[PDB]
Amino acid sequence: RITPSGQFDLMSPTFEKGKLLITIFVLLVITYFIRPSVSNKKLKSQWLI
């Protein structure tokens, strides 16, 4: 089996899918960190209720 250009059709045999998935999870955890924090902090601090 021969590839003229190197394989462009095959997805890969050798992705670092684990790195991609973990980076996505890093996004989700940082959401979990900031959203209650920033929503409470800024809305209630700038309104000075």
Select 24 or 48, whichever has its Cβ closest to other proteins. 48
Select 23 or 40, whichever has its Cβ closest to other proteins. 40
In the complex, least distance from residue 31 CB atom to other proteins, rounded to whole angstroms: 18
Calpha distance 42→38 (Å, rounded) = 6
In the complex, least distance from residue 48 CB atom to other proteins, rounded to whole angstroms: 5
- SS3 labels along the chain: CCCCCCCCCCCCCCCCHHHHHHHHHHHHHHHHHHHHHHHHHHHHHHHCC
Q: Which residues bind other proteins (CB under 8 A)?
A: 39-40, 43-45, 47-49
